[PDB]
Structures are given as C-alpha cells and as structure tokens.
Amino acid sequence: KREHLRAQEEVKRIQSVPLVIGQFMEMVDQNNGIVGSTTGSNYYVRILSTINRELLKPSASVALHRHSNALVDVLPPEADSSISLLSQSEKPDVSYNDIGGCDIQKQEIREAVELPLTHHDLYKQIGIDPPRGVLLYGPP
Amino acid sequence: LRPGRIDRKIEFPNPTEESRFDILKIHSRRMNLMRGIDLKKIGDKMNGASGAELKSVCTEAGMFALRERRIHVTQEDFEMAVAKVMKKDTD
Amino acid sequence: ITKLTPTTRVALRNDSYVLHLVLPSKVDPLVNLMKVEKVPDSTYDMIGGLDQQIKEIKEVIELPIKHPELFESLGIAQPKGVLLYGPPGTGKTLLARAVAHHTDCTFIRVSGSELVQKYIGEGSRMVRELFVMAREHAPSIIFMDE
Amino acid sequence: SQNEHLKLANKIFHLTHPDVEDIEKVSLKEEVLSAIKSDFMVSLYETLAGNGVLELDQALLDSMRQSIEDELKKLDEKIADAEENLGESEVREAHLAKSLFYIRIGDKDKALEQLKVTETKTVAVGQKMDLVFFTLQVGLFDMDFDLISRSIDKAKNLFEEGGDWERKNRLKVYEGLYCMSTRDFKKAASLFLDSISTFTTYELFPYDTFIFYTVLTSIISLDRVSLKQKVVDAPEILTVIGKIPYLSEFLNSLYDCQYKSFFSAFAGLTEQIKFDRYLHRHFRYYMREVRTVVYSQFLESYKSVTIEAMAKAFGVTVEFIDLELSRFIAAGKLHCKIDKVVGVLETNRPDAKNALYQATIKQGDFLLNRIQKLSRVIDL
Amino acid sequence: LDDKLLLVDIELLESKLHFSLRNLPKAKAALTAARTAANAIYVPPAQQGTIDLQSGILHAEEKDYKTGYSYFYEAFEAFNALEDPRAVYSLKYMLLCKVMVNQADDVAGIISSKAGLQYLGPDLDAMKAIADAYSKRSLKLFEASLVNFKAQLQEDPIIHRHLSSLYDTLLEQNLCRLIEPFSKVEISHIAELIELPVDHVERKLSQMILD
C-alpha cells in the first residue's frame, strides 16, 4: 500500500509541464489509442491512466510528450474562435425595428428561432421539430 | 426517350381531396391535436394544391399554437394556417 | 495478411514503421456521401395516396428482388428504367424514399455537386464513378433529381 | 378485430364480478349473442362451464370451427401466391392484418408468433407501433401484468423519433387505465389532462363518460389548489358534465362545502363503483379515502368544533360520527383529538416531520428486507 | 366579392358586437376569421392595432392574461405609431393585465417609460393608484381610488368586468398580510382590523383554506 501510494508518481511524471496540442479521435482499447494531432498527420499512442478516460470521445484538446508525443493530460477548449460573448463589444444594440417594418419579412422567422431557443418545452411537446438553422438570403 | 431506356413510367398527379384525407392522417398524426379534428372540411378547403403544401399546412398549424403557447392546436389553428398556406399559394 | 483488408487502417510503429495492430472501423466513403446527402428515410405505410403507383414500383423493380425467377418463367428482360414525374415534390420524392425503405436498397440521389466528387474520383472524367461505389454494394438503387 | 374487444371483456366481466350481477341471465344471453357469432371459439369454454349446460353447442361449434378453418385455409391459399411474386412479404403482410383476427378468434399463441413475425418485417415504426398496441390490449384481457411491462417500454422507445401524438396521447390512456386498474390512483390523475385532450374510441364512445371517469380519480389525487385546477376542469365539465346532473352535483358538493348532500350522491357513486368493472377490485378503498378527505377538510377549518354540530350539518347520527372518528384517529391519520364527556372535538397541528419520518422507516425496512433475502439466495 | 379589407372591418365589428353581448365563443370565432382574412392582406397599422386590442380584450376576459398582455403591447405600439387616442386605452389595458399578474411593481416602471410620459393623464393616475393599492396589500385605498377615479374605471365596461376580480385579489392579499403576525387569531379581531363583517371574514377565510 505504501508503494501504490507512489502511484501518483506516474501522474507527476506523465503531466510534466511542456505538453503540446492534440485531439481525441478514438481508441483501439483501454491504454491504447490513435489520436488526431495538429501536425496534420496522425499518431497512435497509449493513454495516461491517471485521467478520466470518459472525457470527450468525439473530439477534444489533449497533450503529447515532445519525444513520445503521447497524452499526459487534457486542457480546456482553447481556439481562435474569439470571445463570442464579448458583452457590449460584440453587442450590436440595434433597435429590433430595423430598416423598414419587416413585420413578416423576417420578424416571424426570428420569432420561430427564439421559440426553438427559449420555449424549448413548446418546440418539444408539440413534436413540430423546429427548424435546424437560419441561412439568410436576399438581394444585396 | 428511346423506348428501351425508360422501362416504365410513373407520374405523381396532384392529389385531390380523396387523396388528401390520407395525406392529412399521415401529416397531422405526429401533432398535438384538439379533441375532435374535423379534418374532412379542411381537406375540402384544400382544392388539391400538391403533395407538399399539405405538409406545410399541417406544420403551419403549430405556428399559431406556439404563438399562444397553446397545448394543442384546435381545428381553428389548422384552419387559420390553411389560409396562410393558400395565402402564399395565391401570391 | 488476409484479415488485413486492403484500403483499411492498421497500426504503424514510429521508429520502425512496423505493423503494430489493425484499425477497426476507420471509414466508408459511400456512407459519408450518403450522410452528406441526408436522405429522408421513410416508410411504405407512410405513402400518401399512390397505392397503385406503389404496386407499380414494386412490380417495376422489387419483383426481381424477392422473386428473381419471376421473369425467367416468362422469358422477359429485366426492367431497367423507372422515372418519377409530375408536380414537383408531390410525394414522388417520398415515394422513392419509401421504395428503398420497404425494399432495403442502397439509396444514392445526386444533384451533380462537386464536394461529393472528392469521394468518387480525382477528376471524375466519366459518370462511371458512382457505379464503382454501387458496384460493390449490389443491393443498391439509383435516384436522380430533375 | 380487437376494437370491440371492449364489448366482450366488459360484458363478460360484469357478468362474472359483483356476485354474478344479481340473477345472472341477461348477461349470458347477450354475450352468447356475441359469442356464437363472429367466429369466437376459444375464450368461452369455461364461461360455458360458468354458464348452464347448453347441451347442444356441438353443431354451434362445428359451423364456426369450420368457419375458423375457411379463413385459415385462405391464408393457406394466399401464402403460396404471395411468395411466387413477392411484394413486401405479402404472406406476412396479408396475415399481419389477419393475425388480429386470429388474435380474436384463436388465443394469444396465433397472435404472439405472428406479431413477432411481422415485427421484423416493417422497417418503419408506423406498422410496428400499431402492433405493440395490439400486444397491450390482449395484455389487459389475460391481465398479463408482466407482459405489459416489457412492451410499454418497447412502445415508448418508438415514439421519440417523430412526434406521434396519436401514438402518444392514445398511449397515455393505456397507462391511465393501467394505473387505475391496479392500486396506483396517482397516475390516474396524470391521464386526467390526457383525457381532456384525447378522443372517443369504440371502447369509450361517450365523451361525457370518459370525462366523468377522469373526475373520480382527480378528487383523491389533488388538493384544492389543484381543485381550483379541477374547477378549470369543471369549466371543462360545464362543457361535458353539464350533460350530467349526477356527477356535477357530486363533484361540486365537495367544492361548495355542501357537506350533507355530499354523502347522498357518494352512496350512489360507490354503489355504481361496485357494479362497474375495474373499480370493483378497490371500491372499498375509495370511499374510506373519500370519507377521510371529507372529514379532515371540515376539521382543518377550526381549532375545535363540538361533536354534536356535525350531525345536523354534515351527516346524521351522532354516535355514527363517534364510531367513525374513533377508528381513523386510531388508524394514525386525521390529525385531531376527540373529547368525550364535555362533548367537543379538538384539533392539533403536527409538523411534517414525524409523519414524514414514518413512511421512511417503512421503505428502509422494506428495501433491507429485499436485499438481505437476496444475498442469502445468491452465493448459496 | 373578395373585398378583404372590408371583410376584416365587418368581421371585427361583428366580433365587437358579440363581445358586448357576452357571447365570448362566437366573438372569438369572428376574431379568428378576421385575423385569417387579415393575414392575406397588408393591414394598415390602425386596423392591425384594432385587431390586437380586440384580441387582447377577449383573451383577458378568458382570464388568459399573458396573451392579452402581449396583444396589448402590440396594440400600444400600433396606436402610438399613429398618435391615435386609442393608444391611451391600450395603455390602460396593458396596466390592468400587469396588475392582474401580481407584478404591480412594473406599473411604476412602465409609467416612467418614454411612451407613458407622452400620455400622462388622470386615467394613468388611476392606474398608478391601483398599482399602489396592490403593492402594499390594503383594500381601503382600493375603494378610495374606485371612488376617486369613477369617471376613469367603472364607465369603462372592460375595466368594470375585472374590477370585481381585482377587488377579490386585493382582499386575499391584504388578508395574507394581516394573518402573518399570528399563528392563532380571533376572527372578530380580523374583522375589526379589516372592518368587514365577521361572517364574511369567516366565509372567505374558509374559502381560502379550501383554496
């Protein structure tokens, strides 16, 4: 038992400090996987047992040893998608009444989008399957 | 159009009321109706538009029902949405 | 070696690039093309007011599916061409979908796009590209929009 | 078909429950009016044994077991023509509609092997989910309380793709009649709104009758904030129970605090509850919960009212009230405390701690009874 | 004749007639028909505001207050866009709907709105007084405002038809205020505090417990 307590030494060694980018794609089995790497190519390596194996099976951001290029930890999502919710900075603050009445021109479509977004229970009980996405189209 | 190319031909004629009844029974089957439907009259109001306009009308009915957060679109809501579908049909 | 399916993924060592293990389920290009298509899977019982056309399509194609000996006794050629015409999207699209649904055939409907071309071939000089995908999935049907 | 199965079941069950419905005679006539026609063979051999002799039924059977065979052999004249030029397994596809005949005509065995046959046939659920409803309805006649537990989940797993509200709101009726058929009056009130929005099938053609049914379970399941919800249900009753003089007077007397006339129609409903099928397993449990709900509604309205006031305003018989309130306080409910020789009833108020602790120690003993007995059974 | 504008006008008048006749079902059917016809034509803002106002009135009558809420904001926007004095009645109906939703606090916020400031009037003062009465849960100023703003409240048939329910709710909430300082209380004491007869207090508290 006093030795298996040293089974945080494996964690310490693995984690290290200089970890690189990665992406979780799938695993051959436990303690075995093939990853998706930023290097454009793919390499398959083992896993870091000292982790929540059930993290993100589809895709994520994992690490790799400079030489071994193997996951030793998994950081949070960090991308160049920018601060989407930039509060006032990314906030148009535009009067709903925009360039003309557009009372059914686009108002009803926006209302349907808001009903799928906020009244989720409503677009759910009825079973009407609200639309998937909004792609604006019209004269330049 | 060579006779040996098209082995057989099948056309999709515009459904009539006799055909729209089953179309309605299929389309509204997934909706939350009101006790008592009376879809026969509505299909009568449907003057054989197409095999898709019925789908929108059935879907469009839920539009008003959501607009009032109603828990079931009664024969009034489907009737109203029928005009909106035909409103686009007449444009 | 035989178990190692050609055009399939197996593990590869790094210092040696020697075989390490097989890769289970990497990809199926036809499945990807179909997913890009996003076909509206239907059901024969959900067919709207085209019962006679339903039997015609069955008698048109499906007959040499559950009974390939039907035309052998009569000595007639296998039907080749079937087309859906009439008012646009009058359920003809839905009738086609339900056909495969109740028939269990590989549905592939194309609109002549270019993204799917990346899976058929590098240049797609001729229209035989789709056949190659179908040619190994014999239980398939072909649908083409207007 | 299984759509009038309602007639069969209800009629025969009335004839068999309530001590054979007085002098059993018109029930064995009108069921036999439906038995020796429409090709019924199997479900009434012991019902003939529960009936009289009816000595010559042999020619009555032989004309029908032949008519059983004539529909059976035309399947046997269809299964070879449907396979020579196959549609979508038109052998099965013919008798996927004619198994429900053979479900009515035969027993469950000709149904269960043909429904699970055609369950692998159809690739869309719109024929699958109607087969599952057929499995539910036979699961009520033969009261297959363990076979309904499987296919209800197997039903419910199908509705989520699509909305299928005629396959959902119809489904809510089936749990509603199941949660009331056995002791679960809680979910009965669930399908109350479900019935508000449902429709009239062959079983329940009378909307007013379905409406009244959704009211007997509501007056137990919910209190009077939810009985203001039930007054919204009573505007729904001005819509439907406005045709009912009995049930309108019965529900509103509890709401209008017309306490004395409340028992008058309660005697009517409970007698009707006895002769009715499917409430007759629990008609004695209903009123003793409706008595204790009518008592404590009045008693919670005072710190303490005398015991001789409830005779002339609530129900006559002072000593009748005496023996009734003595057996319910001793039963551990109806939170008050009666005095005897100064002739008064006093109430108290306990917290929701002692009574909430009481139901916990029942379930904790019950679950530990389950797992201690289990761990002895396994591992020798 | 397919004269959809005139058809909508006639159907709205017909709906108003049966609203006056207290025949809510047929009035609602008429309103639905009018909205269906209007959906086929570009309705002028005044007329569209008229349908919004009438729909709000019918839905509020049904006691479905949030829908009439939304409908009367539609109506106020429509009328204020036209500076039509019926925006004034639209404002009153919105404030009624809010006060009925137990959100009496929002009355002060709405009144301070730019649109409200344009329409300051004795009737708006009536609405503010009603909200104030609702806020502190006291009936006496409710009678005081009913007497003070008689010209504003009772002669309006729509307002009068809900004055009763508002009176009742004010009774209820003032009673709830009054009972909190006790766990036991004498009924006559409650009566004198509210100066309503002991028998009515007893009956209404019995109803509250039943509710």
Q: Cβ contacts of residue D229 below 8 Å, gap of 6+? A: D222
As a CATH number, domain B17-90 is 1.10.8.60
Residue D159 and residue D168 in contact, taking contact as beta carbons nearer than 8 Å: yes
Residue D2 and residue D103 in contact, taking contact as beta carbons nearer than 8 Å: yes
- Residue A5: half-sphere exposure toward Cβ, Cα within 13 Å: 3
CA distance E194 to E181: 15
Angle among Cα C127, C129, C130 to the nearest 5 degrees reads 95
Among the listed residues D204, D210, D209, the one whose alpha carbon sits nearest the alpha carbon of residue D192: D210
What sign does the dihedral D246-D251-D256-D262 (CA atoms) show? positive
Residue B74 and residue E29 in contact, taking contact as beta carbons nearer than 8 Å: no
Token pair belonging to A140: 């330049």
Question: Which stretches does DSSP call E strand in chain D?
Answer: 336-338, 345-347
Residue D308 and residue D317 in contact, taking contact as beta carbons nearer than 8 Å: no
The three state secondary structure string of D122-142 is CCCHHHHHHHHHHHHHHHHHC
CA distance B75 to E36: 13
Count CB atoms within 10 A of the CB of residue E181.
7
CA distance E14 to E54: 11
Q: Do the bridges between strand D336-338 and strand D345-347 make them parallel or antiparallel, or are there none, so unpaired?
A: antiparallel
CA distance D68 to A34: 64
The three state secondary structure string of chain C is CCCCCCCCCEEECCCCCCEEEECCCCCCHHHHHHHHHCCCCCCHHHCCCCHHHHHHHHHHHHHHHHCCCHHHHHCCCCCCCEEEECCCCCCHHHHHHHHHHHHCCEEEEECCCCCCHHHHCCCCCCCHHHHHHHHCCCCEEEEECC
CA distance D246 to D268: 9
Residue D180 and residue D172 in contact, taking contact as beta carbons nearer than 8 Å: no
Closest approach of A81 to chain C, Cα-based (Å): 25
CA distance D104 to D7: 13
Q: Reported resolution in A? A: 3.3
Residue C13 and residue C6 in contact, taking contact as beta carbons nearer than 8 Å: no
Tell me the residue type at C77: A
Question: In terms of C-beta distances under 8 Å and separation of at least 24 residues, what long-range contacts does D248-256 make, across chains too?
Answer: D251/D215, D251/D219, D254/D219, D254/D227, D254/D294, D254/D297, D255/D224, D255/D227, D255/D230, D255/D231, D255/E210
Residue E142 and residue E117 in contact, taking contact as beta carbons nearer than 8 Å: no
Count CB atoms within 10 A of the CB of residue E174.
20
Helix (H, G, I), strand (E, B) or coil at A45: strand
Binary contact (C11, A44; C-beta < 8 A) = yes
Within-domain flag for C21: no
CA distance E133 to E127: 10
CA distance D129 to D154: 9
Among the listed residues E88, E23, E22, E21, the one whose alpha carbon sits nearest the alpha carbon of residue E49: E88
**Helices within A49-128 (DSSP H only):** 107-117, 122-125
- Residue B9: half-sphere exposure toward Cβ, Cα within 13 Å: 10
For residue C127, give the CATH number of its domain: 3.40.50.300
Among the listed residues D3, D220, D236, D233, the one whose alpha carbon sits nearest the alpha carbon of residue D97: D3
Total domain count, chain C: 1
CA distance D156 to D128: 12
CA distance D289 to D220: 8
Within-domain flag for C50: yes
Among the listed residues C1, C33, C51, C23, the one whose alpha carbon sits nearest the alpha carbon of residue C119: C33
* Smallest CA–CA distance from B28 into chain C, residue: C46
Among the listed residues E63, E61, E59, the one whose alpha carbon sits nearest the alpha carbon of residue E73: E59
**Helices within D276-336 (DSSP H only):** 283-299, 310-314, 318-329
Question: In terms of C-beta distances under 8 Å and separation of at least 24 residues, what long-range contacts does D85-90 make, across chains too?
Answer: D85/C63, D85/C67, D85/C70, D86/C62, D86/C63, D86/C65, D86/C66, D86/C67, D87/C55, D87/C58, D87/C62, D87/C66, D88/C44, D88/C58, D88/C62, D88/C66, D88/C102, D88/C103, D88/D121, D89/C66, D89/D121
Tell me the residue type at B14: N
Among the listed residues E195, E196, E193, E135, the one whose alpha carbon sits nearest the alpha carbon of residue E169: E135
CA distance E6 to D371: 77
Within-domain flag for C22: no
Binary contact (A34, C11; C-beta < 8 A) = yes
- Cα–Cα distances (Å) from D72 to D65, D81, D119, in that order, read 10, 15, 21
Range of the domain at C47: 30-146
* Window 56-85 of B, Cβ < 8 Å to D: 71-72
Binary contact (A126, B59; C-beta < 8 A) = no
CA distance E87 to E79: 5
Residues in chain A, how many?
A: 140
**First vs last C-alpha separation in chain D:** 50
Token pair belonging to C141: 């049907």
Question: In terms of C-beta distances under 8 Å and separation of at least 24 residues, what long-range contacts does A102-109 make, across chains too?
Answer: A106/A136, A109/A134
Residue A33 is inside which H or E element, if any?
Answer: strand A32-34
Q: Buried b vs exposed e over C73-84: b needs ≥16 C-beta within 10 Å?
A: eeeeeeeeebeb
φ, ψ at C20 (rounded to 5°)? -115, -40
Residue C34 and residue C105 in contact, taking contact as beta carbons nearer than 8 Å: no
DSSP assignment of E120-155 equals --HHHHHHHHHHHHHHHT-SHHHHHHHHHTHHHHTT
CA dihedral A61, A62, A66, A67 (to 10 degrees): -130
What radius of gyration, in Å, describes the C-alpha atoms of chain B? 16
CA distance C98 to C40: 9
CA distance E177 to E118: 36
Angle among Cα C96, C98, C103 to the nearest 5 degrees reads 100
- Cα–Cα distances (Å) from D172 to B67, D167, D187, E158, in that order, read 26, 9, 10, 41
Token pair belonging to E52: 């919004």
CA distance D141 to C73: 49
Among the listed residues D191, D190, D209, D189, the one whose alpha carbon sits nearest the alpha carbon of residue D200: D209
What radius of gyration, in Å, describes the C-alpha atoms of chain A? 24
Binary contact (B76, E67; C-beta < 8 A) = no
Domain ranges of chain D: 4-347
Q: Please identify which residue in the block is written with the tokens 């009774």.
A: E171
Please tell me what DSSP assigns to residue A31.
T
Q: Please identify which residue in the block is written with the tokens 């959100």.
A: E103
DSSP assignment of chain E equals ---HHHHHHHHHHHHHHHHHTT-HHHHHHHHHHHHHHHTTS---HHHHHHHHHHHHHHHHHTT-HHHHHHHHHHHHHHHHTTT-THHHHHHHHHHHHHHHTT-THHHHHHHTSHHHHHT--HHHHHHHHHHHHHHHT-SHHHHHHHHHTHHHHTTSHHHHHHHHHHHHHHHHHHHHHHHTT-SS--HHHHHHHHTS-HHHHHHHHHHHHH-
Closest approach of C132 to chain A, Cα-based (Å): 28
Q: Please identify which residue in the block is written with the tokens 């909190």.
A: E180
Among the listed residues C90, C88, C100, the one whose alpha carbon sits nearest the alpha carbon of residue C39: C100
Residue D135 and residue D146 in contact, taking contact as beta carbons nearer than 8 Å: no
Largest CA distance in chain C: 66
Angle among Cα E121, E125, E131 to the nearest 5 degrees reads 145
Chain A hits for C12, Cβ within 8 Å: 44
Q: Please, which experimental method was used?
A: cryo-EM
- Cα–Cα distances (Å) from D210 to A50, B37, D198, D231, D236, in that order, read 61, 18, 10, 17, 12
Binary contact (A34, C23; C-beta < 8 A) = yes
Within-domain flag for C18: no
Chains that touch C (3 or more CB pairs under 8 A): A, B, D
Closest approach of A122 to chain C, Cα-based (Å): 24
CA distance E211 to E200: 16
CA distance E196 to E184: 19
> Which residues sit opposite A45 in a β-bridge?
A33
CA distance A23 to A74: 9
- Cα–Cα distances (Å) from E58 to D206, E97, E163, E178, in that order, read 31, 12, 16, 35
CA distance C13 to C80: 50
What sign does the dihedral D141-D144-D149-D152 (CA atoms) show? negative
Token pair belonging to D262: 């409340």
Residue D266 and residue D250 in contact, taking contact as beta carbons nearer than 8 Å: yes
- Cα–Cα distances (Å) from D236 to A129, D220, D224, E50, E65, in that order, read 30, 18, 17, 30, 19
Token pair belonging to A67: 């030489």
Token pair belonging to B28: 């509204």
Residue D34 and residue D7 in contact, taking contact as beta carbons nearer than 8 Å: yes
Closest approach of B55 to chain C, Cα-based (Å): 10
Binding-site residues on chain B for chain C (CB distance < 8 A): 4-15, 18-20, 22-23, 26, 50-52
Residue D325 and residue D334 in contact, taking contact as beta carbons nearer than 8 Å: yes
**Helices within chain A (DSSP H only):** 9-15, 107-117, 122-125
CA distance B64 to B18: 27
What radius of gyration, in Å, describes the C-alpha atoms of chain D? 26
Chains that touch A (3 or more CB pairs under 8 A): B, C, D
Residue C50 and residue C96 in contact, taking contact as beta carbons nearer than 8 Å: no
Within-domain flag for C8: no
* Smallest CA–CA distance from D197 into chain B, residue: B35
Burial class (CB in 10 A: 0-12, 13-18, 19+), E91: buried
Among the listed residues D192, D173, D306, D170, the one whose alpha carbon sits nearest the alpha carbon of residue D251: D192
What sign does the dihedral E85-E90-E96-E102 (CA atoms) show? negative
Residue E174 and residue E205 in contact, taking contact as beta carbons nearer than 8 Å: no
Task: Fold for D4-347, please state it.
Answer: 1.25.40
Burial class (CB in 10 A: 0-12, 13-18, 19+), C6: exposed
Token pair belonging to E112: 């301070």
Binary contact (C67, D89; C-beta < 8 A) = no
CA distance E153 to B2: 83
CA distance D181 to D217: 12
Closest approach of D136 to chain C, Cα-based (Å): 21
Chain A hits for D163, Cβ within 8 Å: 126-129
